[PDB]
Amino acid sequence: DAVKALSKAIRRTRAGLKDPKRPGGSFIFAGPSGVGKTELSKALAEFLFGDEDALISLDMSEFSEKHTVSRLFGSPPGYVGYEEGGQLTEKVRRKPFSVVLFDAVEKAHPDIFNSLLQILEDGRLTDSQGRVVDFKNTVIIMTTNLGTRDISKGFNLGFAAQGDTKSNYERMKNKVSDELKQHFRPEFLNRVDDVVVFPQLSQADILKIVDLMIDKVDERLKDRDMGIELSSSAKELLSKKGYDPVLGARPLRRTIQREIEDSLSEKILFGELRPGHIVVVDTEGEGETKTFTFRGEE
Amino acid sequence: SLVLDQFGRNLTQAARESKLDPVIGREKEIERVMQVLSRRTKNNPVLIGEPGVGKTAVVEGLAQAIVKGEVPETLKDKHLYTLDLGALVAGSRYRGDFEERLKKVLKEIRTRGDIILFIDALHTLVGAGAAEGAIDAASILKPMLARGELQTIGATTLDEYRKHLEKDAALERRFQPIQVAEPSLPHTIEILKGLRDRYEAHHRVSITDEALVQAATLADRYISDRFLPDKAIDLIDEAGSRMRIRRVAEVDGELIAEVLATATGIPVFKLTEEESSRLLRMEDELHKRVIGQVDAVKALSKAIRRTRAGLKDPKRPGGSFIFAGPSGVGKTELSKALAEFLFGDEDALISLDMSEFSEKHTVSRLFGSPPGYVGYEEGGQLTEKVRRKPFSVVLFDAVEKAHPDIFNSLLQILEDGRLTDSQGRVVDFKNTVIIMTTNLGTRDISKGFNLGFAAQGDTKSNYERMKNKVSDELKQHFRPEFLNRVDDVVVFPQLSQADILKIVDLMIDKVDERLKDRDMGIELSSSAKELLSKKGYDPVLGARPLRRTIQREIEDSLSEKILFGELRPGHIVVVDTEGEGETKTFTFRGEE
Amino acid sequence: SLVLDQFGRNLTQAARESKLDPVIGREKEIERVMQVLSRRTKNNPVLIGEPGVGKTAVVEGLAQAIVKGEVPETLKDKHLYTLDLGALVAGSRYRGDFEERLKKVLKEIRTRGDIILFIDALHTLVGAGAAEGAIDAASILKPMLARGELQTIGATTLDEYRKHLEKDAALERRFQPIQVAEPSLPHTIEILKGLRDRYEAHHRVSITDEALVQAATLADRYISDRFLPDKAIDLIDEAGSRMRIRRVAEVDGELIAEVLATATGIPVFKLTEEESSRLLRMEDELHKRVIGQVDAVKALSKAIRRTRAGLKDPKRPGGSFIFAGPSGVGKTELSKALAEFLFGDEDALISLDMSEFSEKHTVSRLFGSPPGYVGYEEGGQLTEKVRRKPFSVV
Ligand SMILES: Nc1ncnc2c1ncn2[C@@H]1O[C@H](COP(=O)(O)OP(=O)(O)OP(=O)(O)O)[C@@H](O)[C@H]1O
Ligand SMILES: Nc1ncnc2c1ncn2[C@@H]1O[C@H](COP(=O)(O)OP(=O)(O)OP(=O)(O)O)[C@@H](O)[C@H]1O
Ligand SMILES: Nc1ncnc2c1ncn2[C@@H]1O[C@H](COP(=O)(O)OP(=O)(O)OP(=O)(O)O)[C@@H](O)[C@H]1O
Ligand SMILES: Nc1ncnc2c1ncn2[C@@H]1O[C@H](COP(=O)(O)OP(=O)(O)OP(=O)(O)O)[C@@H](O)[C@H]1O
Ligand SMILES: Nc1ncnc2c1ncn2[C@@H]1O[C@H](COP(=O)(O)OP(=O)(O)O)[C@@H](O)[C@H]1O
Ligand SMILES: [Mg+2]
Ligand SMILES: [Mg+2]
Ligand SMILES: [Mg+2]
Ligand SMILES: [Mg+2]
């Protein structure tokens, strides 16, 4: 859903139909942690500009005090730091076509939202210099992790029926939307183009993430003339071990670094796996007592 | 052209003499410069970009192309002169001298016609002669730039352009800005390939392709305050200089890694037979100081040998650990031991006492003051400490005693491995090891059990009961995402009698080291050690009470003797025990 | 060179006259400085370190090495000149005077190729030129530094390197920073042994072997705001000066301990028989003010005796006590009596009334305000008191 919404916004902007008074897109991502809210922003930045480092990312946890708005506006006249403008405004001014990202926007001071209302409707912002900076060609994304304690709990009080993947997502979406409505001002939520709630990851989704993570590990290994290959049973075991229906794909990464990366490290240190070799990982055993086996070939 | 070259340099002649380094991959920027130079009005561009990206290299390549004749017919043979500001001012002592010098130069430009001016520090043009003469060296240049009969090229960084040129709206519209971007990795590799031949002769060496690739990648990854085309170049230059000073004379990846490791201190050099010093031996080295905590030592050793043996996540710190458990079990001792193992001295640890962060605003001690507020001139303390020493061990002591709205600032450090200074600078934490020590879910262990009837239970059961309670306390205290971005959570079991009997040896060795300054020593016969371990077991307070015993049972008595003159330098004290029922005698005898 | 001699000082000639103190144990720093200097494009090293770790000593050792015949090629017979930057700006009354000096000296450097410039306090290079219509020396020196026709060695402390040299990134990128680390204890011992011969001659005294170890250890342990290679030298030199003012001459560790005790106030000097007897009768001395309460007086006496006997843990306070009791039994009187016995009276006690600390947000009275808040420069109230008097009773 989020990919479709983002692609629709990009296509609409590129076809000469987007509103010339507002930014190209305004999205609020919400849901559990480790689902891929930040990964989508990096993927979009890499698609648009060819490199994920072209993303203007702000960590809003550093804006927990009301007097830190000058960090993105600039100091008032006559004060220290007037020679340097707002950190965000200069970056946007140099690159009018860019992607702006606000991580954990709910952890910042409410006064921060005071600024965003100018961007989301008027599409321009004014710094202490008196200059006006336009945001009409940017894509604004706010990632939010609100109400996440309830997802960890799961279900509600009572005799809830045996539900499917549809019901759980609907309940989570309702709870997250209610939390967003309660926490934020009505004006801010009214001006945002899209509010996308990321559903949980399924067991089938985990296998492809295992493939990607093992590809990353192989990329790391290629720097020393080395490679890794996994059988289907190994990937199945990894998906079984690393599945967590609450915390997302991070437990899978921890499992991969604990079961595969560590043993590879001792084997490399011991001199078993010299450069110019390939590591083959397979499974041995049955039931819950299955164990990975590592072998070296040329 | 005497007035020209006596106040400038002929870049075209230098290019004809092949005294300029080759320029690679700047075809688009040079083409845009030539495009702008051909405009009817306002035909003078200015190159803006971060320092070190090669803004002057674009003009160098333009001069080389003009010499080689691949330029449009509108340029063809036009001499490119770099203006030497300051040489104009070097003699303008009397009134109206800098002005006449500049007017003579400009009239020469008009008469000869085929000259392109290059002003390196264009922001220094404003107020070059703002003296009693009161001309500013730019108030008179404005009409020519406006009409377009004078063609110049400028090259200033973004900050200087914003601070100086952007103030004057008049000069703002006379120039056309051109962005010069930082080259990517393959572009830097091509640049290194081109400059390799030139760099061979100076150092009389040979450089491999693998050396170039390694230099580019390592410069991109491990150096943070410099920009890409320069870091690879100066790494190659320093490696060549090292190889030359050492004297086939060839450089490769290992030499580049050694140079980079020496420069920054990050251990990126090759693995010699010291890999045995960490394989199967790091745990023993740690256990020589920390007794009876196998899980945490194993986790730390795994993390260190993972980050040393190649594969490791290049976007996240080396490891992140939460040490939980009872009081006085060795949580801080393990961090100190790890710091000593890694750096040779426990003073290299970067420790933060979180008990001083009980208030929300104290977070400014990590970041620094925001712009326009007092104290903004100096940055955050933690950020500066990490920036000076990229590879270090950071400890957050008594983590639970700080305000909950503090660790929100740790979210980007743990997952993304960076922290943004209040001045806008980014400091990377990707080479550090983060340890957080806590004491949550422990206050009730003094009595045991929760309430009501309970099962039989044993030592394993009590440990399992404590672990779940600590995990629940952590979950209800920390946000789920913060615990999600944590590599390991390690719970420390309480110490046992054998652990105390082993710890008394370490404490007695410390007392012996204290006495060695004034040329004495101590013995502590085995029965005395066993009795000392017997007094002060107390499996609720860890190894601290035992220390108190050693304080009040040994080093008091010795002190009295030292004050009385009973025992002097050149003697040692032998301690033994007497009696059976209470066996509490601790007889001291002084012998040479 | 006459042109250079007007503004600057020749380090090589001074080293040839044995007017520079010997430099010990800085092989790695000198090696890396020579490594950077023999480069092609940016051979301009800058030494960054703490104020006192011996940055200038590294350069003086480099001068002694280059005039010894013990340096690699492309550096033999080079001449190190320390540039002033004070005489250059002096006598720059009219426009185009300061720049004229730099152009002249730079042309002299170009003509005489075997010259290396050395600039103390490189941070003042930026902006050193002038206000109004005059470009600074940094702008003049930028073209030559980047291309590599002017070797230059700079030296700044970390704070001033970060606070001044980092507002001009274009100038900063033309220097390769080298970090000079504070020496360890054995390295400090070696440095003291090396400088013992030079420091004996000025005072015409003798320094025993144990005195160096005592000075190094005591300076490393009991002085906080200074850095190691300087404080031990300060101790040795001041002891020598003291005893020559007192007057074969021999300086032993006891003089060092007495000098440090006088300087800081912490009693580290040797125990006399009178002092030992007083410490043994401390209980009777304290009972002249407090009647009864034997256990507390005994505990305090035991703590003080551990401190004076040299068995105190060097990482923790001398003693920590909780006096719990009813009203009007002598809890505060005992503290006042201990303070009077220790220093000179009950007025030296650092007393804090916890009745004022009722609100949990009053902790700032111990620390101070965080950066960007009112009262930030005042500092802590307890921390300042303890820093002024390291040996006190809180
Ligand atoms: N859909 C996905 N596809 C691939 N990788 C994923 C996906 N979701 C999560 N990951 C992986 O999870 C890790 C972190 O995910 P990410 O940062 O995108 O999560 P998030 O939603 O931003 O979480 P948080 O709430 O903690 O900010 C990365 O290793 C990333 O590759
Ligand atoms: N395209 C390129 N091809 C070859 N070498 C290059 C290129 N770009 C930069 N360099 C090299 O990078 C180094 C520094 O570049 P340069 O001096 O042009 O930077 P600059 O942008 O003018 O920076 P500064 O702000 O210091 O003036 C030089 O050694 C130069 O040869
Ligand atoms: N396993 C151990 N091995 C050696 N010494 C130990 C051990 N555990 C505790 N100690 C000793 O106990 C004293 C204090 O222990 P430490 O500072 O490590 O405690 P901690 O676990 O961090 O406790 P707290 O929760 O009070 O911070 C030190 O003298 C230390 O040497
Ligand atoms: N043991 C004692 N010897 C001499 N005078 C004593 C003794 N105990 C109390 N006093 C007298 O008590 C008065 C003050 O008592 P002090 O301040 O020591 O009380 P305290 O025990 O600290 O009680 P509180 O703080 O609860 O009021 C003085 O006049 C002091 O002489
Ligand atoms: N390696 C060394 N060997 C001998 N003496 C040294 C060494 N390093 C420093 N010193 C001494 O320590 C003192 C440090 O002074 P100085 O160099 O001015 O400090 P800074 O480097 O901070 O300017 C000098 O007087 C010098 O004699
Ligand atoms: Mg995220
Ligand atoms: Mg340049
Ligand atoms: Mg601790
Ligand atoms: Mg009282």
Side-chain angles (χ1 to χ4, degrees), chain B residues 6 23 33 38 106 117 123-124 130 150 235 258 269 319 336 356 371 405 415 426 437 448 489 500 516 580:
Chain B
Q6 188 274 330
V23 186
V33 174
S38 300
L106 196 144
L117 262 184
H123 66 86
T124 59
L150 186 55
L235 289 177
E258 185 67 29
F269 63 91
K336 285 177 200 159
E356 317 170 19
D405 189 358
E415 173 82 353
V426 182
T437 62
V489 172
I500 301 298
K516 274 300 187 56
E580 294 293 328

mmCIF file of all heavy atoms in Angstrom, chain B residues 6 23 33 38 106 117 123-124 130 150 235 258 269 319 336 356 371 405 415 426 437 448 489 500 516 580:
data_model
loop_
_atom_site.group_PDB
_atom_site.id
_atom_site.type_symbol
_atom_site.label_atom_id
_atom_site.label_comp_id
_atom_site.label_asym_id
_atom_site.label_seq_id
_atom_site.Cartn_x
_atom_site.Cartn_y
_atom_site.Cartn_z
ATOM 1 N N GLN B 6 52.396 40.351 -14.303
ATOM 2 C CA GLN B 6 53.023 40.859 -13.091
ATOM 3 C C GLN B 6 52.002 41.006 -11.965
ATOM 4 O O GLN B 6 52.380 41.090 -10.791
ATOM 5 C CB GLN B 6 53.756 42.165 -13.425
ATOM 6 C CG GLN B 6 54.631 42.755 -12.329
ATOM 7 C CD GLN B 6 53.858 43.642 -11.387
ATOM 8 O OE1 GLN B 6 52.872 44.260 -11.786
ATOM 9 N NE2 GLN B 6 54.289 43.706 -10.134
ATOM 10 N N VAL B 23 42.559 16.355 -15.652
ATOM 11 C CA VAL B 23 41.205 16.463 -15.122
ATOM 12 C C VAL B 23 40.340 15.426 -15.824
ATOM 13 O O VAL B 23 40.361 15.327 -17.057
ATOM 14 C CB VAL B 23 40.634 17.879 -15.312
ATOM 15 C CG1 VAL B 23 39.290 18.003 -14.621
ATOM 16 C CG2 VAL B 23 41.609 18.907 -14.771
ATOM 17 N N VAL B 33 30.206 25.444 -18.183
ATOM 18 C CA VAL B 33 30.986 26.674 -18.050
ATOM 19 C C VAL B 33 31.161 27.341 -19.409
ATOM 20 O O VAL B 33 30.988 28.557 -19.550
ATOM 21 C CB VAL B 33 32.343 26.387 -17.384
ATOM 22 C CG1 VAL B 33 33.206 27.633 -17.394
ATOM 23 C CG2 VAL B 33 32.136 25.917 -15.958
ATOM 24 N N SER B 38 29.450 31.910 -23.171
ATOM 25 C CA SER B 38 29.062 32.371 -24.497
ATOM 26 C C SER B 38 27.796 33.217 -24.497
ATOM 27 O O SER B 38 27.331 33.605 -25.574
ATOM 28 C CB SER B 38 28.876 31.175 -25.434
ATOM 29 O OG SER B 38 30.077 30.435 -25.552
ATOM 30 N N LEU B 106 42.290 46.312 -16.309
ATOM 31 C CA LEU B 106 41.039 46.171 -17.044
ATOM 32 C C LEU B 106 41.145 46.770 -18.443
ATOM 33 O O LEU B 106 40.582 46.227 -19.401
ATOM 34 C CB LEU B 106 39.902 46.817 -16.257
ATOM 35 C CG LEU B 106 38.479 46.456 -16.676
ATOM 36 C CD1 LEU B 106 37.606 46.371 -15.445
ATOM 37 C CD2 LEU B 106 37.917 47.472 -17.657
ATOM 38 N N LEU B 117 39.399 36.052 -17.314
ATOM 39 C CA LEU B 117 39.881 36.215 -15.952
ATOM 40 C C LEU B 117 39.338 35.119 -15.045
ATOM 41 O O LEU B 117 38.189 34.688 -15.171
ATOM 42 C CB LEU B 117 39.482 37.584 -15.402
ATOM 43 C CG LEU B 117 40.547 38.677 -15.472
ATOM 44 C CD1 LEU B 117 40.047 39.950 -14.812
ATOM 45 C CD2 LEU B 117 41.835 38.203 -14.823
ATOM 46 N N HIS B 123 34.872 35.575 -3.016
ATOM 47 C CA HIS B 123 34.308 36.266 -1.864
ATOM 48 C C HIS B 123 35.272 37.289 -1.280
ATOM 49 O O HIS B 123 34.829 38.233 -0.620
ATOM 50 C CB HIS B 123 33.894 35.261 -0.790
ATOM 51 C CG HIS B 123 35.040 34.524 -0.175
ATOM 52 N ND1 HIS B 123 35.761 35.024 0.887
ATOM 53 C CD2 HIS B 123 35.590 33.323 -0.471
ATOM 54 C CE1 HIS B 123 36.705 34.162 1.220
ATOM 55 N NE2 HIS B 123 36.624 33.122 0.412
ATOM 56 N N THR B 124 36.576 37.124 -1.506
ATOM 57 C CA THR B 124 37.550 38.123 -1.084
ATOM 58 C C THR B 124 37.547 39.356 -1.973
ATOM 59 O O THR B 124 38.152 40.367 -1.601
ATOM 60 C CB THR B 124 38.958 37.525 -1.062
ATOM 61 O OG1 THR B 124 39.296 37.049 -2.369
ATOM 62 C CG2 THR B 124 39.035 36.376 -0.072
ATOM 63 N N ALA B 130 38.604 48.274 0.557
ATOM 64 C CA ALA B 130 37.666 49.111 1.304
ATOM 65 C C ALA B 130 38.445 49.882 2.365
ATOM 66 O O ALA B 130 38.405 49.588 3.561
ATOM 67 C CB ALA B 130 36.560 48.265 1.923
ATOM 68 N N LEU B 150 32.967 42.001 -19.948
ATOM 69 C CA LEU B 150 34.036 41.380 -19.178
ATOM 70 C C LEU B 150 33.598 39.983 -18.766
ATOM 71 O O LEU B 150 32.482 39.802 -18.268
ATOM 72 C CB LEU B 150 34.386 42.213 -17.944
ATOM 73 C CG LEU B 150 35.591 41.724 -17.144
ATOM 74 C CD1 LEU B 150 36.807 41.593 -18.045
ATOM 75 C CD2 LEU B 150 35.880 42.659 -15.984
ATOM 76 N N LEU B 235 45.762 9.785 0.886
ATOM 77 C CA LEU B 235 46.138 8.446 1.338
ATOM 78 C C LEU B 235 47.164 7.821 0.402
ATOM 79 O O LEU B 235 48.167 7.252 0.851
ATOM 80 C CB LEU B 235 44.910 7.546 1.460
ATOM 81 C CG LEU B 235 43.943 7.842 2.603
ATOM 82 C CD1 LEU B 235 42.747 6.916 2.530
ATOM 83 C CD2 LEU B 235 44.649 7.703 3.936
ATOM 84 N N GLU B 258 47.389 0.077 6.523
ATOM 85 C CA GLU B 258 48.275 0.450 7.619
ATOM 86 C C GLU B 258 48.337 1.962 7.787
ATOM 87 O O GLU B 258 48.288 2.473 8.913
ATOM 88 C CB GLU B 258 49.673 -0.118 7.379
ATOM 89 C CG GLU B 258 50.640 0.125 8.519
ATOM 90 C CD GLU B 258 50.265 -0.638 9.773
ATOM 91 O OE1 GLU B 258 49.648 -1.717 9.653
ATOM 92 O OE2 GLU B 258 50.587 -0.159 10.881
ATOM 93 N N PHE B 269 44.013 -2.703 9.850
ATOM 94 C CA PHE B 269 45.198 -3.325 9.280
ATOM 95 C C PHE B 269 45.052 -4.847 9.261
ATOM 96 O O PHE B 269 44.085 -5.416 9.774
ATOM 97 C CB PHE B 269 46.439 -2.868 10.043
ATOM 98 C CG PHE B 269 46.455 -3.281 11.484
ATOM 99 C CD1 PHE B 269 47.033 -4.475 11.876
ATOM 100 C CD2 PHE B 269 45.901 -2.463 12.453
ATOM 101 C CE1 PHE B 269 47.047 -4.850 13.205
ATOM 102 C CE2 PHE B 269 45.911 -2.832 13.782
ATOM 103 C CZ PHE B 269 46.485 -4.025 14.159
ATOM 104 N N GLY B 319 28.960 -2.899 18.706
ATOM 105 C CA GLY B 319 28.069 -3.661 19.556
ATOM 106 C C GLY B 319 27.357 -2.759 20.533
ATOM 107 O O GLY B 319 27.845 -1.679 20.877
ATOM 108 N N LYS B 336 35.500 -1.733 32.435
ATOM 109 C CA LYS B 336 36.869 -1.275 32.650
ATOM 110 C C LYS B 336 37.878 -2.300 32.144
ATOM 111 O O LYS B 336 38.901 -1.936 31.551
ATOM 112 C CB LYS B 336 37.099 -0.978 34.129
ATOM 113 C CG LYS B 336 36.462 0.313 34.603
ATOM 114 C CD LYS B 336 36.667 0.505 36.091
ATOM 115 C CE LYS B 336 35.663 1.489 36.656
ATOM 116 N NZ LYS B 336 35.506 1.332 38.126
ATOM 117 N N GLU B 356 23.443 12.359 36.693
ATOM 118 C CA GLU B 356 23.431 13.802 36.515
ATOM 119 C C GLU B 356 22.502 14.251 35.397
ATOM 120 O O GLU B 356 22.405 15.453 35.135
ATOM 121 C CB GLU B 356 24.847 14.311 36.237
ATOM 122 C CG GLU B 356 25.910 13.682 37.114
ATOM 123 C CD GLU B 356 27.311 14.027 36.659
ATOM 124 O OE1 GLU B 356 27.463 15.015 35.914
ATOM 125 O OE2 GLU B 356 28.260 13.314 37.047
ATOM 126 N N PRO B 371 21.581 27.274 18.078
ATOM 127 C CA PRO B 371 22.097 28.549 17.565
ATOM 128 C C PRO B 371 21.409 29.740 18.215
ATOM 129 O O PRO B 371 20.194 29.751 18.412
ATOM 130 C CB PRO B 371 21.794 28.475 16.066
ATOM 131 C CG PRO B 371 21.703 27.024 15.770
ATOM 132 C CD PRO B 371 21.123 26.388 16.994
ATOM 133 N N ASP B 405 13.032 10.791 28.836
ATOM 134 C CA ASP B 405 13.169 11.553 27.596
ATOM 135 C C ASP B 405 14.618 11.987 27.387
ATOM 136 O O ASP B 405 14.930 13.154 27.156
ATOM 137 C CB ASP B 405 12.225 12.751 27.623
ATOM 138 C CG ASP B 405 12.144 13.477 26.288
ATOM 139 O OD1 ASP B 405 12.844 13.077 25.333
ATOM 140 O OD2 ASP B 405 11.373 14.455 26.196
ATOM 141 N N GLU B 415 20.932 2.506 16.020
ATOM 142 C CA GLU B 415 20.483 1.929 14.758
ATOM 143 C C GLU B 415 21.201 2.513 13.550
ATOM 144 O O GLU B 415 21.567 1.774 12.633
ATOM 145 C CB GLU B 415 18.970 2.120 14.603
ATOM 146 C CG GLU B 415 18.426 1.701 13.247
ATOM 147 C CD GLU B 415 18.191 0.205 13.140
ATOM 148 O OE1 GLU B 415 18.566 -0.530 14.077
ATOM 149 O OE2 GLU B 415 17.627 -0.236 12.119
ATOM 150 N N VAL B 426 27.882 16.195 11.736
ATOM 151 C CA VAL B 426 27.490 14.816 11.997
ATOM 152 C C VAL B 426 28.706 14.063 12.517
ATOM 153 O O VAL B 426 29.781 14.114 11.907
ATOM 154 C CB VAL B 426 26.923 14.142 10.737
ATOM 155 C CG1 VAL B 426 26.478 12.726 11.047
ATOM 156 C CG2 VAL B 426 25.773 14.956 10.177
ATOM 157 N N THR B 437 24.787 0.231 31.737
ATOM 158 C CA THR B 437 24.648 -0.554 32.955
ATOM 159 C C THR B 437 23.424 -0.102 33.737
ATOM 160 O O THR B 437 23.171 1.098 33.873
ATOM 161 C CB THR B 437 25.893 -0.439 33.834
ATOM 162 O OG1 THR B 437 26.075 0.923 34.233
ATOM 163 C CG2 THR B 437 27.118 -0.910 33.080
ATOM 164 N N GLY B 448 13.602 -12.391 48.628
ATOM 165 C CA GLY B 448 13.140 -13.492 47.812
ATOM 166 C C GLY B 448 11.626 -13.581 47.794
ATOM 167 O O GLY B 448 10.922 -12.927 48.562
ATOM 168 N N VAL B 489 21.154 -8.080 25.629
ATOM 169 C CA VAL B 489 20.769 -7.798 27.006
ATOM 170 C C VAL B 489 21.288 -8.945 27.859
ATOM 171 O O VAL B 489 20.858 -10.092 27.690
ATOM 172 C CB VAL B 489 19.247 -7.647 27.159
ATOM 173 C CG1 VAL B 489 18.873 -7.540 28.625
ATOM 174 C CG2 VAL B 489 18.757 -6.435 26.391
ATOM 175 N N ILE B 500 33.851 -15.538 45.578
ATOM 176 C CA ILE B 500 34.414 -14.677 46.614
ATOM 177 C C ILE B 500 35.808 -15.151 47.006
ATOM 178 O O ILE B 500 36.723 -14.341 47.213
ATOM 179 C CB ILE B 500 33.470 -14.626 47.827
ATOM 180 C CG1 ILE B 500 32.099 -14.093 47.413
ATOM 181 C CG2 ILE B 500 34.059 -13.765 48.925
ATOM 182 C CD1 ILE B 500 32.134 -12.687 46.873
ATOM 183 N N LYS B 516 53.615 -1.885 48.079
ATOM 184 C CA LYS B 516 54.894 -1.933 47.377
ATOM 185 C C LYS B 516 55.518 -0.559 47.181
ATOM 186 O O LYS B 516 56.729 -0.471 46.954
ATOM 187 C CB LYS B 516 54.722 -2.613 46.019
ATOM 188 C CG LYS B 516 54.833 -4.123 46.065
ATOM 189 C CD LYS B 516 56.191 -4.557 46.582
ATOM 190 C CE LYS B 516 56.369 -6.059 46.461
ATOM 191 N NZ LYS B 516 56.169 -6.523 45.061
ATOM 192 N N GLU B 580 39.725 -22.190 66.656
ATOM 193 C CA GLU B 580 38.855 -23.034 65.846
ATOM 194 C C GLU B 580 37.400 -22.597 65.874
ATOM 195 O O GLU B 580 36.785 -22.448 64.811
ATOM 196 C CB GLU B 580 38.973 -24.498 66.297
ATOM 197 C CG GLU B 580 40.342 -25.105 66.041
ATOM 198 C CD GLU B 580 40.648 -25.243 64.561
ATOM 199 O OE1 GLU B 580 39.702 -25.456 63.773
ATOM 200 O OE2 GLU B 580 41.835 -25.137 64.185
#
